[PDB]
Structure formats: C-alpha cells, structure tokens
Amino acid sequence: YEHTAVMPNKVGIPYKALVERPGYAPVHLQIQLVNTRIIPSTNLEYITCKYKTKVPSPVVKCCGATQCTSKPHPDYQCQVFTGVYPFMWGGAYCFCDTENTQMSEAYVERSEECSIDHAKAYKVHTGTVQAMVNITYGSVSWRSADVYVNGETPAKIGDAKLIIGPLSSAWSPFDNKVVVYGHEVYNYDFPEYGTGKAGSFGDLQSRTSTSNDLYANTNLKLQRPQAGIVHTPFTQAPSGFERWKRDKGAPLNDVAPFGCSIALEPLRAENCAVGSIPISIDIPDAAFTRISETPTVSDLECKITECTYASDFGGIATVAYKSSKAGNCPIHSPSGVAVIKENDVTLAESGSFTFHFSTANIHPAFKLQVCTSAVTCKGDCKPPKDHIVDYPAQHTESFT
Amino acid sequence: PTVSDLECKITECTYASDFGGIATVAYKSSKAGNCPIHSPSGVAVIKEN
C-alpha cells in the first residue's frame, strides 16, 4: 500500500519496484536515487595547496645586533648567515667589515596555482540537507519530488506523496574536519585553524584566497647563500598539492562506505550505486487505479518476445492477457528483482502485450503485478554481449 | 518461442524426390509468425524456406 524502499542508490539507469495492492491495481515505483547529494552547513577552515615562497625582501641587518622586521603573513622565516659578503655587481650594502652578513628572509604566500586547482579544508556539519528522488506513480508514471533528507516535510507531486531521507543523502564519509584534494576528499582532522600540519594537509593554511595572511607551517628552512651571493634558498616539505593522491589518506573518489564517489566539494555525494536513501511514500487509495477500474487479470500467460540479459532495459516478453474487467493497468515487478521500464502496460482481454524490463539474470523469472495479477515472464534473455552501462538497472543486480 | 501443437496430412503427395509433394498442416504456435521447415532427416526435402 505504501512502498517504502531503502533500496540501493541508482543514478545511472533508474530502478523500479512495485507497490502491491489487492484492493486497487498494483502500481509501479521508479525509485531513482539520482541525487544522494548533501547540503552541509560548513565553514572554510583553510585552503591548503602548495606554497609559493614569494619572499619579502630581506631586512638585512649585518651588525649592531641583527634586526629582522616582519611583514604580513604569519609564520615568518628569517635566518642570518655570515661568511658571505653581499655582491650583486661587486657591491656592498653591509655595514661592518668585522661582519660579512647575508640575511635570508622568506614568508609563504599562496601559489598562483592555489587559485586554480587546489585543496580546500572544511568544518562540515550536517546542515539543511536535501535530495530528490523519482517515484513513477499511478499510471501518470512520473513524479520527482525534492524534500529534506531528515524526512520532515513530505511533498505530493503527482499521485504519490514522497518523503526522501532521513540521513542517507545528508552525510558523505566526511568527518567534522576534512581536507579535500582533487576529486579525493580526505578525512583529515585538525584542531581548527591556527595549527601547523607541515608535510601534510594544512602545511599552508590560508583563510583567504590570494593571501595576505595565512599560517604556514610548511617546514620552511633557509640555507646559506654561499660565496657572497645575495639570494634566499627555500627548502620546504611537499604539500597537499604536490602529492597525497598516492600518499593518500582515505581517498573518497576511490573509497566510500556511503557507496558514492566524491569530488572537490564542501561535501556532496556524486554517483552513488549503493548508499540507499530510505524512501517512503504516502500514497492514498486515490494514488492507485482501482481493481475493477483496471483489469483483474485472469487467464494470463507470459513468454518472451525476447528478453535481454543485462541490467539495462530492452528485455521484452509478451503476456497473453485476458482478465474479467478492463481499464488501464499499471505493472511492475515486486522490487528491483526485475526492473521494468514499462510502468504501465496496455491490456485488452484475450490479447497479448509486450512490456519492457531489465533483468540481472539470463532467465527472466520475475513476477509482474499486472493490475492485481502476478505472472512469471519466463523465457530467454539474450545479452547485448557485454554490458558497459555504468550501473545495473536492477540497482545492485537484484536477480529476477 | 516454441511451436505448440500441429498435425500434418497430405493434400496429395509424390512417390518421388521431385518437388511436388504437398501436405496441409494445421499449425499452432506459442506466438504466431514464421517457422522455417525441413525434414530433420532430409528424407523429405522441403522447398519451403
């Protein structure tokens, strides 16, 4: 009567199920968990990415105490070096003949590559989550409502009233703190902004793009510019945009107990083939077409016309229908066991009518609930040789 | 899918392997359509494709 389904996510080739009803004709669902998306309430904690030591010009004090005055960008590396007297054409600027100093100074500033192609941390909370889901319904055979994933607000679009969620499209495998580097979202904790994570994620930590301030524990180490040369060499640990895609933590575009893949995101959940959104529909008696205002199919028999073995649509099977009433006649197989493209089958008494479907097996022995009548549409399913369709129509290859 | 019932009897035949022998067949089938035929021994050689 009210076909709940926490059936595997599908997004690539919709899956189908059947509301059995004996008072009224059974009515189809196409439960398309196409968006398993998230709407976190979040906070940009820090961009990370490979640095650029766009050095401030060294505040060289050569004697009379060394003074290095700081300029914008917290975490300011400055190191005196002696035994080098500064030349640039043969020149000098140092102001002792008892000290030959070259004082190298370097701060971290965001790379220009940080602007475009970069890692991005987040403090991720559940927030005001939502997902949209198709239910084909009645004999209208389409309605795709979008409601909050937490139940909360039902919405009746077409015949069915459709409730999406609770939470199963409101969380990805994110932790509270996550760093993201590419497609791959990395469940990488840190104790808020203001912390140092050199040689990992948060080596650079800018809270603004095209930075003028950041926190850069990048393991920045100045070395001696030997032979009276004036330059600043920067020795620095690799970043969250120099690797961590094979020095990976938990690479979410390659792992997920949410059964999804993830991109460079404040956390959304792309392309889920399992991760089941628990779907709940409130379908009144009205939402069905009634038993005697539809056929009640009696004397039916099913045989293939030609099924296709593959969890993609194309399998067909005539059913030599014959009933005791006439009308419209919704059809569907019980669950994703056979996923039927035809939400509705036309029915005339003593005729024969092919419907469309998809199977996860070579024998199409799925019941089809033809307006208060099951029938096994057994026969022969000739595969399309080789299935390259991205996901199974069934929803997880649920067998007929 | 499977050819379900049928019975055959002459409508005057040949005593010869010349093609001229005919026989009506009260055919019936799981689904109506075409049905290629030939004797499965080839003792009757059938001109009907």
Swiss-Prot record, chain A:
<feature type="region of interest" description="E1 fusion peptide loop">
    <location>
        <begin position="84"/>
        <end position="101"/>
    </location>
</feature>
<feature type="glycosylation site" description="N-linked (GlcNAc...) asparagine; by host">
    <location>
        <position position="134"/>
    </location>
</feature>
<feature type="disulfide bond">
    <location>
        <begin position="62"/>
        <end position="94"/>
    </location>
</feature>
<protein>
    <recommendedName>
        <fullName>Spike glycoprotein E1</fullName>
    </recommendedName>
</protein>
<feature type="disulfide bond">
    <location>
        <begin position="307"/>
        <end position="381"/>
    </location>
</feature>
<feature type="topological domain" description="Extracellular">
    <location>
        <begin position="1"/>
        <end position="400"/>
    </location>
</feature>
<feature type="disulfide bond">
    <location>
        <begin position="49"/>
        <end position="114"/>
    </location>
</feature>
<feature type="disulfide bond">
    <location>
        <begin position="329"/>
        <end position="371"/>
    </location>
</feature>
<feature type="disulfide bond">
    <location>
        <begin position="302"/>
        <end position="377"/>
    </location>
</feature>
<feature type="disulfide bond">
    <location>
        <begin position="68"/>
        <end position="78"/>
    </location>
</feature>
<comment type="subunit">
    <text>The precursor of protein E3/E2 and E1 form a heterodimer shortly after synthesis. Processing of the precursor of protein E3/E2 into E2 and E3 results in a heterodimer of the spike glycoproteins E2 and E1. Spike at virion surface are constituted of three E2-E1 heterodimers. After target cell attachment and endocytosis, E1 change conformation to form homotrimers. Interacts with 6K protein.</text>
</comment>
<comment type="function">
    <text>Class II viral fusion protein. Fusion activity is inactive as long as E1 is bound to E2 in mature virion. After virus attachment to target cell and endocytosis, acidification of the endosome would induce dissociation of E1/E2 heterodimer and concomitant trimerization of the E1 subunits. This E1 trimer is fusion active, and promotes release of viral nucleocapsid in cytoplasm after endosome and viral membrane fusion. Efficient fusion requires the presence of cholesterol and sphingolipid in the target membrane.</text>
</comment>
<feature type="disulfide bond">
    <location>
        <begin position="260"/>
        <end position="272"/>
    </location>
</feature>
<feature type="disulfide bond">
    <location>
        <begin position="63"/>
        <end position="96"/>
    </location>
</feature>
From Swiss-Prot, chain B:
<comment type="function">
    <text>Class II viral fusion protein. Fusion activity is inactive as long as E1 is bound to E2 in mature virion. After virus attachment to target cell and endocytosis, acidification of the endosome would induce dissociation of E1/E2 heterodimer and concomitant trimerization of the E1 subunits. This E1 trimer is fusion active, and promotes release of viral nucleocapsid in cytoplasm after endosome and viral membrane fusion. Efficient fusion requires the presence of cholesterol and sphingolipid in the target membrane.</text>
</comment>
<comment type="subunit">
    <text>The precursor of protein E3/E2 and E1 form a heterodimer shortly after synthesis. Processing of the precursor of protein E3/E2 into E2 and E3 results in a heterodimer of the spike glycoproteins E2 and E1. Spike at virion surface are constituted of three E2-E1 heterodimers. After target cell attachment and endocytosis, E1 change conformation to form homotrimers. Interacts with 6K protein.</text>
</comment>
<protein>
    <recommendedName>
        <fullName>Spike glycoprotein E1</fullName>
    </recommendedName>
</protein>
